[model samples]
Target chain A: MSKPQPIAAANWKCNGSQQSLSELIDLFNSTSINHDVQCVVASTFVHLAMTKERLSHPKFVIAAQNAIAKSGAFTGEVSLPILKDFGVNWIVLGHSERRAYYGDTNEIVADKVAAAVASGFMVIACIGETLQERESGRTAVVVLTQIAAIAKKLKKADWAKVVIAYEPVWAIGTGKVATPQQAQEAHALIRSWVSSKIGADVAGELRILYGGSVNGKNARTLYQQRDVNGFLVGGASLKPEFVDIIKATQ
Target chain B: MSKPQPIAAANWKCNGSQQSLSELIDLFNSTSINHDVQCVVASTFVHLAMTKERLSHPKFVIAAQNAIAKSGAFTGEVSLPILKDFGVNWIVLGHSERRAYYGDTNEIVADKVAAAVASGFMVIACIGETLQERESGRTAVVVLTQIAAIAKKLKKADWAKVVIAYEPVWAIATPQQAQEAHALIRSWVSSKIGADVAGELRILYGGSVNGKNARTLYQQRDVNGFLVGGASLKPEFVDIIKATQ
Candidate 1:
């Protein structure tokens, strides 16, 4: 198991601007860094440089909301190397925005997860089932398939750089929060699935963050689970309680 | 019609790396910037930030190979404002790569051109026919349809910001360069595309443009300029720019 700070990532999905980056940085600087929370703000590509330029301290890390698997003839894509060149070390992959709006299949996310990690960048691989998939009791089947794809592609050591984020589609940006049991079941199932590939130790050591309506009030319950290592904060990540969630993790 | 920059440009599509930028810079820095040749290099989005920062000057402008019409929810897209923020005032839209591989329809290219120019960007809008379209004798129909999309979407003055490159998909990167065919397409823009809208536009010939054949192609009147391809990635790219004289 990796002995690192509990990650509290902020995914600013299609939001922010030049001024927005400065505001977030200024707010972060004024508020003290929570030692327990590995603060990573996943921002839009346009503002990556500003985030790295301002917030590259040990206390905070900046991440790209999404990036192409490889940089090539794929027009309009900003590749991992470009993000790395701009000092962005962390990458957020397979977020629902990509899966829903674009065509990031389980296979594609696994490819990106493998590429991001192999290239020396840490990956926050996102996976979750849709409302329909969940209501139908296919949650276990769906989420496992997502993890299985990543597991199949990577070697044993590659799993070291992976951080799984189990966000429920119904809960994300819809103001719904998953109950502790729902969160626990998914995380435990994911951990078990991962354990089969990398062995029990790394699987247990592997961190799984709960995202969607993950404000301070609900954060404590989610963090209490053995499977839920941290929280991938969304809208509330830009709120006052973002600090509260970090303090609670400690 | 537009005295803003060089009509002759190089589009290094899906090529170059971090180190390649420095070599390109070194080569460009050593070349004499011809007043007549407005040199602009349109590179992929991956290299845009450094390309603009490394080569920011009146002598040359860096352009994005393509940009999304809107910035929100379009994953895998680098927005125009994002490109402009990085100092890339030029944009290359409707290249054959996006057209054939991706679904860049005539309407889509037109919308992108209108959006790019409306937002203060100078655009290098590409229009071309495929080998099938060319052999089938529908080259004029194919190209006219492509240009009409932009002409219909944009205003007369908006055409001033656009430089059209007639790159037959059959010839790109194949070193197949010529005149009668290239001139025929240019004549159409000026003749059919509202002698005024098409008149203000400068049509460029692009298809495996190289140093060896570029000089002879430039001497043609209708072949006002050349839209360089493969050679743009090599050192000889400078020699061809000098040929613009």
Candidate 2:
């Protein structure tokens, strides 16, 4: 009956501490964040506790930047259960940096997704192809393959809590953004694929977010697309311009 | 000089949070913890601030569990400068888990050691050989190679702050520890090599150290002390029977 609401997630990757994190939270609290959109900030594990303590808004939810699937035994890792205990409601599963540098495979990401869902947390399942894959015309194929891995593990109803972030590897942190048309085309294809595999209602409700060098300058055009719901901002989220992007979706 | 007082470092590894950490400090504060020995608590980066806050005794110092060589960029990594800012006087460098999981090579650990020294923090440099290497009788060769890699990078005068933890990789978390004779031999060989290179460094022993075994292990000749792990969690850690007269 009504339009699906937008969601904006900030992936602060490897940034911020107590003072700087407090400053960012103050900025977010002071800014004009849109009422209709959902705002999530995914920060490093160390900052999560303090961030949770400082930022107390119904619209602004906190997510762990990365979470391990297992309960314990892996040193220097933050587990999903720990994140749950810390009151984290969302997790960003399988970012390109994790897949590239940290030996996370599609299967591992799927396992992590299952763990997060089983723990009753929302998931922003990230999937995308590299520059080489896109150039070779295998962008859709690679993206579908990653999605299928997670799809096979989840049920139709589980799709409600999941938001797919298509962050192409080449564009992340390289100052190269995917054109609005290119992003709209990918979002449309992904939506169609979701409708075919899972049902129309489920597909229609799912949010497809565009990540990879997303900033305030180009956020408006991306949000204007019929299928593009919101953004998974990276570097720009560290700055105040993130507020502008959130306002753009309003 | 007064036979350089024995040194004890507790490597807490990836344990403790804000809530339970204060218990450890309270335990340390109340106990008789041998004033003759240098007591240090190496804690996870997240708990360092809390650990520093509760520790008031001059004898009880704090050490960071691990640190990155660079100032920034590496996600989830704490830097030496940041630890120094927290008044962390010591850092546990080159732990087995760090070397095995995080791809920390000897060269990288050496650079980290140099960075820590430059940042004005003492270092408890860890070195060890795998079971296979030990079986092949290359223990001396393996340990020496790892030591030399970092030894070449340090200034001769900086040796005073360096304490070596000879942790045999095979016994790290395993049930059985190296035999006393084996530990003695390793310590002797390390002292011989270190005296020639780094000069009169303290050689502490680590690997599956518990309350039951600590007493005997602490008595081994040349085994100047213990780098405790699991036992450090107990409230009686300060009175750890081995160190008590």
Candidate 3:
């Protein structure tokens, strides 16, 4: 199999605007595209139309931060087809915020992932254990169970279509990093479990992007951890150093 | 106060696009517009940015079908501020589809109304009883309960800010018109809700209103105007607009 191309996905998360396009334009232009590094921004839906119009560059593709389960009468929802119609290939499914606030249960998010994949969407499936669960030594159990819902539903071949983002609920946007060792252990566990469910060969081919507080200063060590292929950045993603985070994988 | 200007609002529920927009622009232009009637199309949010950019006309403005309560981290939800930023003046609140499928409860729709009004949006607040509720002879109770949620919350003056669209959930898109039921509710709206609101606020009739019956529906003592649906997408919407004349 070919080498895993590193991914740097920025979650704009209810932020950014039409004015922010220039920043992204510069980010896209300034990128010295490493053949092995892939980059995209998960822009807010409000700015997506403008982004798709201007940022057609392959290096700076856009991802929708959320979508409805499917294309029916759920008002106030941007459905998967709507996002795809706008050329959004990647989707950030089941973010911790959505699960906590907007009632995106594991079952609902799994439904989102299943429908998205069937409709030819590539998903950034998120799974994480909260601080309380992590403290009880059930971090693996928590994340795996969340993942198991999607995994069991996905055909073994469908495994390659998803990239897992293991964001420990406690570490996200808190100005604290999950120690590289901590991330490595969690990712390794995910790999082992996936390998057991799917197959060792397909497991190695699977991409796992680490999320939460991923900044330039910390990117390299996290990248140094063999299983941490790339990052799904949140707060730092809107800043200039996101370029640096992209370069960090190099 | 001056006579209430008749309103013809088209709720294009979960529909429309840049392609379909031309039909509306044609409707707006072909409309030898009636001076007494005002028109607006509530477009879905997916195409709103494009609609605001292209369909700029005084005769017809844009309304968002729905919005989130506030501006924050709730994904897949568009807030009222987001709509206002794009120059959206009106919002259609509490459509039955959202209430039935998406869990938009009375309390939740109330919160949305409060948020939108605070943001200075003119709302088309919809309320209606289902077939079962009407069959159970609780239509007035059900309808008033829905309106009472918003009425008690608003200042007396705020009544003028909202136009009530009485959409009987069963009659919506069902083709069988509700004429007697229409006059009865309009009476209740004016009487049960007290004189202040009944005097200034409009009570719009909705559900299964098309080009054929819309002119007749307008002649009703109630049905002050219309909150039209499916007809809005077809050429018939233009005829419905003329019904105001």
Candidate 4:
């Protein structure tokens, strides 16, 4: 499967103040990317408006960590229209943390993906198996089931604007990581599932990203996998190594 | 019981764009208050920082509509520390809309209020009876139970930072109808706890609160001020603010 331009994204998680975020922005602005990748960063909502205006790096863009599907009456939740109003083009939906903690189920995620894409926003749709499921050897079943829920809501054309991030919940922020073979196996299953079920044309073009404990050291090795297009960096996303991870795509 | 600097707070309730919000700010900045009032405005989080910076009226300040109990790792949720980082001093917790839709149960709402008060932010703690509860003639029981949950989490000293906004779920109340609910809540606090505690409590009437009805409601003994909704986005809110005079 040939990939389009790979994506290198940073999920800052629930971290950073204005000062710390500004420093990170300045560092990313000054660093030479030295490669071609769709560079994106997802910040917590509190700093999103400020980040969009301040991060003037020509290659870099901003993503909101999450938003509600629609606008109105749902107090304390951000909506897609508002996210668009702030000039954001990318949205990271169904992050495992959100699914686990804040009550976003597979159906809920699919609904959010549908609403966001319909509103013309690009989606980094994350799917993964938890530690129990992985240990039970149901990784394929779990990840695909999650993808199937999202696929049910999207049309053939919507896949072009979607990137599937395979972050094994067990490995995320717990310091455990998937081996290159493990990552590839999951990505291959997703691409093949698309190929057989949807169409080979769309499957070949879909980009599957590997996340969880991705650092500067392993990024290049991970990028070597035929199906492992790029990464969704977490903790390292807040560090200088984030730029290193971006350059790994070269 | 005298009111403690009657508050005329605005709950923008998931509306406004940067352009419209800037205009609202300009309107509030130029409008004459004509009297003493604790002026507060709550906007969706997207525009909170901008509203804080642009709304420079000495009496007016920004408030966040909601916040999680603590910070970190709860994706898609805003926390109290982050609200403070953006220079917000007031937080509107337990609004009816959040309670009905987003699963803010009685316990969840109490946890948020405790966390916010402990963080030293002023709280506009909302409590009210829905149409069902009100029509069943259980308005007193319903409203009192809601308050008791919040009171269970706070010490007597913490009450000073809390303002009770009794917004009926119906969003459809006449002036005297709203006054009846307001008086029952104010009296319930006075009898169940102590007169001293109730004397310090500032309960605002909300529900279909517009400029025309504000003066009649403001004249009532139990109605301290208002926690305004839709009208807060318009110039008519200025009249509601001055209605207290």
Each model's RMSD to truth, in Å? 3.6, 3.7, 3.2, 2.0
TM-score of 2: 0.85
Expressed as tens digits, the lDDT of each residue in A1-250 for candidate 3 is 4438778888877755456655766667656766567687887666677767766456766788888755545545678776676567889998888888777888888988988888788899988988878778899888889999988678877876798998878775555567899899989899889889889887888888898678889998888888888998887787888888988887
Question: How far does residue A5 in candidate 4 sit from its true spot (Å)?
Answer: 1.8
DockQ of each: 0.31, 0.30, 0.40, 0.63
| Residue range A1-250, candidate 1, lDDT tens digits | 5544578887765555566557767777677754656788877665665676676446678888777766555544567766675667899889877788656889988888888888889899999998888879899899988889988888888777889998788665566667988899888899888888679877867888887567878888878877788888777776667778776777
Model 4 stretches astray by more than 4 angstroms: A135-137, A172-177, B191-193
lDDT of 2 at A91: 89
Greater DockQ among 2 and 3 belongs to: 3
Provide TM-scores for the models.
0.85, 0.85, 0.88, 0.94
> Tens digit of lDDT per residue, candidate 1, span B123-214?
88888888888789887788888887877888767778888887778653322345565556657666756666554556777777778877
DockQ value for model 4: 0.63
Worst 10-residue lDDT window for candidate 2 chain B reads: B172-181
Q: How many residue pairs clash in all the candidates, one count each?
A: 1, 0, 0, 0
Off by over 4 Å in 3: A1-3, A20-35, A69-72, A135-137, A172-177, B1-3, B16-18, B21-30, B172-194
Decreasing DockQ order of the candidates: 4, 3, 1, 2
The number of residue pairs in model 2 that clash at the backbone is 0
lDDT of 1 at A132: 82
